[PDB]
Amino acid sequence: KVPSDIEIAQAAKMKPVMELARGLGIQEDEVELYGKYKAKISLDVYRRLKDKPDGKLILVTAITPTPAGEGKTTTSVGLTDALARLGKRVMVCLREPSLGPSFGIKGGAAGGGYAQVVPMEDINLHFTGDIHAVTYAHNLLAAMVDNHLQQGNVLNIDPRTITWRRVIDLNDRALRNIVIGLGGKANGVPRETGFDISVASEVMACLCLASDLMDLKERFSRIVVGYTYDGKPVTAGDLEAQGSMALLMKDAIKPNLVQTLENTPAFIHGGPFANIAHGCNSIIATKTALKLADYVVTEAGFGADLGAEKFYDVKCRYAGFKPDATVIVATVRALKMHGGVPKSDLATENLEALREGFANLEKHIENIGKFGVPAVVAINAFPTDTEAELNLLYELCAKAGAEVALSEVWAKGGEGGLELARKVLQTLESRPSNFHVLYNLDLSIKDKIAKIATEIYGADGVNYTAEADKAIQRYESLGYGNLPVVMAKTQYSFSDDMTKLGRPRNFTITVREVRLSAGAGFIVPITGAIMTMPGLPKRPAACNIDIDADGVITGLF
Amino acid sequence: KVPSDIEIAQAAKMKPVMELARGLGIQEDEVELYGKYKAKISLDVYRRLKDKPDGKLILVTAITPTPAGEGKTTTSVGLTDALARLGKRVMVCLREPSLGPSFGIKGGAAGGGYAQVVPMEDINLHFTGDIHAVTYAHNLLAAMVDNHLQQGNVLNIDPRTITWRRVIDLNDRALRNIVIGLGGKANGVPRETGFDISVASEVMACLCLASDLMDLKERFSRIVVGYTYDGKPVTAGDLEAQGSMALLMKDAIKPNLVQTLENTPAFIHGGPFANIAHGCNSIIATKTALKLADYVVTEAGFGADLGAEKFYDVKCRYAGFKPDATVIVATVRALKMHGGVPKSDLATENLEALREGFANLEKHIENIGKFGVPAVVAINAFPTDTEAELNLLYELCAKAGAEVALSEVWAKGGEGGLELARKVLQTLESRPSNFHVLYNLDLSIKDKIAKIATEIYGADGVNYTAEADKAIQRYESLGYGNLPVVMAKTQYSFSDDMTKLGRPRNFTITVREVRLSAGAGFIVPITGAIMTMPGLPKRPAACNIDIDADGVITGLF
Amino acid sequence: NLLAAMVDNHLQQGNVLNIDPRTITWRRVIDLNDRALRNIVIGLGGKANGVPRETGFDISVASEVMACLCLASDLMDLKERFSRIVVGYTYDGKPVTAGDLEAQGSMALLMKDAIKPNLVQTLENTPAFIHGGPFANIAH
Ligand SMILES: Nc1ncnc2c1ncn2[C@@H]1O[C@H](COP(=O)(O)OP(=O)(O)O)[C@@H](O)[C@H]1O
């Protein structure tokens, strides 16, 4: 018997975040509660502590994802709980989930098992209203664009080249492509546009790479909404919108102090797209936790090929962060799959598969290697992984020359994470990390993409469509050449072939389109149509969700 | 002499709401803070005081609106504050403003001068996120309708008969008329629709008319979104959205405790339109106040002919309230506009036009009479009124059997309302009310409409277009005939012609359209052209809005 | 376009054949160079006005009707080909042809003079037929 995630977080025992705020030496006029159990820590905290030295930066990443599931949050949070069970002054920084999944597929634990962050309900509903403000700032900008068209279009924008869309945090496919502006001289200018899920907002992206508020304000100002008739780009700043957008963000820029079932301080702040964007919680939440703990467990989206890579290449580069360790997660199950084992064959023990599957992990370790960062494999263990496999895998990481550990934080709490914690410590004490950015700003865009594609995915090279080259020609020329590179591609493989599992070689990566996030300050190579607006299943969670007289919720998890 | 509104909202010391909370007999386990100066109060409070007697209910209303501004919210707060001075246990209930105005037309205070509920900024912006919840629940329903189409359209909704629009709390004209569902079979069902500003949402109206959560859930279920190809209604019940929507409103349902400049406790909750909806703050807020205090002041959008009338015929009806008194706000200024005087020369004394305009106010007093509620006029003092004009206003007011007070609450705060406060108290001590609604629900839709039109508006009779006659017959045959009537008409005339100021005679009203709010529980006849989505001006306030590092806001107020 | 008109009417009249409007391959045609018509949304205005859907126009000579005119052996053959024309698919993916909407006789009738070749001549009075005019890329 293990009870369900929800029953767990429910029977759990939360501590007023005000005391946790206290225990980290957050002043009480810097806390801003939302009930006894969530709060916004003013930015003033960091800026009074900007010199006190940063704790030690630990990134949790993982192997390329699989239907089997890796448990990268579970084990990013469990490690956190072990490090507190060892009297380390440690936090965990995490991403806020979109609201949308809650009502479609289902709501999920900020982690899972005995490695959750709480309160789980609030995290999955409106929480502190973070995403409501993004949405509202994005759409106020769009509002202002369409209105600017209505008022005579002084800036001579071609309505048909407007890249600025709209957001809503519901999986609504009906809004993917729409026409707005209908009904005459009074109601605007008809045009084609659409809606993406709000977490994919560039505004969401900025939230997460803004340094202070005035950085968010100015990033806003840089955003490309669309181009004039002569091809000249127009910005949020041209529309003199950056003010009001910043204003709508005033409270959302502040990170949200929650906690674990084991009362370790957690930040939850930001939650951007991991493909068309960098995949991390905000910089604010990390740079703050850094001045507040001696250890900061944090994480990034997908496998290490995308999350970690960008974590280093965009976030760390921006923030001046110098990560220290990095855990890479894995299962004998997720690895059996990378050895041509269909999801039904995860039942039978399979010593032979686990060997070839390993190729995925080894590749990652090398790639983490490539940053001057001390890896550590962590192994999320599963109820039917017979010990045959475990040691066989255990072997292969050491046989591949990097540290390895069993992780039982799912089933056992901070206790199951002690082993791994210790190695992270062994590593933190004895293994310094000369982190370097995998590339240089001044490289041409293609050079940059080559690097990542060649060095990280392990490809023989990159190929570029007619439009893709045309677009890069446009941007280098507009000056947007300096920026980093965010790699819009599948996650389920090192390649773009969503089915090329393991370490496929001989392949090349093909770049179909190239979008700009001037505001976030990056550039997005696309290697496959990107799902920016999911739709609801045949029967949405919504249909089965309910709340009674007592406030009892069913169907949410 | 008197500072600005924003200057005032920052100077005055706010008391931790938890105190105000306790001061009212609200247990700690019933208050959830949103910082120090905001709180949601539990619905458990009303339940634990179900059997205490109600304080006195006092409605603040006004003569016919002009573009000049009228005096209402400011009197509500000002009256409240004077009563607290006079020693009385008093609360004021107010509506939450939409986010929209803040960026286009203008963000003004919840009141003004020294008669303001605060914290200003938070009330005007995201507040405690109620409107966001309303927004998101309404659009989740929308999303669910379209998904229904896409998933085989089992309920057989004719997309084209869909009445459920979408909402956003921005002034976005371009969204009024849209076509969605485009892109292929993968992307939903192409159809026409649009957005309304969030506070026009039936969800908002249900929030404001609900008795608690399970009632709000029920109303939700009764919401009609569209019709089968056969003309049979399809409700949100039918798509099983009520639990989700409810769940999304679980914090939105509790009223928000806040306060005036003088720390008088104050509820802000709900915020509907006064034309397609009843334009009152919530029943939950009002009905709790009546338990926690001996005097509750609340108010209604637009003029007495609209807000007051709907306050009595809808709100009080749903709730079994009985107004003990009612204040009508008049200004010498506007009463002259009603006597012909254009906006440009309102400062010039003109007793004859003032005598003519009084007709407007006279008609309103008569109308409050018809509900059994003793009236008291409040003259909102302006520096350019002459003593002669004021005295003439008191003459007519008494010659019309109404007590009247001058009210300098905008400048002097609670003190400028003592004379009024005392007159109100004199009326309560000596003229106990005989409250009754204007009309019985038995009457047909056309009878109920006639009775309002003739008794209240002073209309001769009422006309219909063929479309209105079809709707009324549809609504009747579908059994919504015994519903209350909410008249969307212009606010600036008793007539349905916005130019016909003063006390128009020999006129007819025309009902062009009839929509239905089955969840809110009423029928909406439309007379003019009704704007359920304002749009941005030439140079929107959002362009002039900034915030710097010090947190200092400019061009927002 | 009569066929087109008949497809949409089919939708409006209760959509008995259960065409998914969105899978409709039968566009409309006009023998003008009109770019603005390539991508359109039709069927708007209310239940009185048809079924909103995406579609567009092709220049008339690209029309399959033109191609059938040019490949037909006579009228009854042109009628048959017509009937076999696929306009779209049921929600189930099964094809719905012009046969299914019973348009082939009408279309045929509309082509009763169109079917005969047109005799004319060269500058030197050598006899000359002009008849048919399809695209050489999507058609022959
Ligand atoms: N060891 C385990 N056994 C069973 N279920 C697990 C285990 N670890 C994680 N899970 C569940 O599966 C999901 C995957 O873990 P999570 O950390 O959320 O994945 P990721 O962060 O890689 O998306 C979690 O929601 C959790 O409930």
Ligand SMILES: Nc1ncnc2c1ncn2[C@@H]1O[C@H](COP(=O)(O)OP(=O)(O)O)[C@@H](O)[C@H]1O
């Ligand atoms: N006596 C007065 N002198 C100056 N300004 C006033 C006075 N009374 C009201 N106002 C202003 O009018 C504005 C809008 O009118 P308000 O007082 O809210 O009345 P209403 O609710 O009828 O619109 C407020 O922001 C307030 O500052």
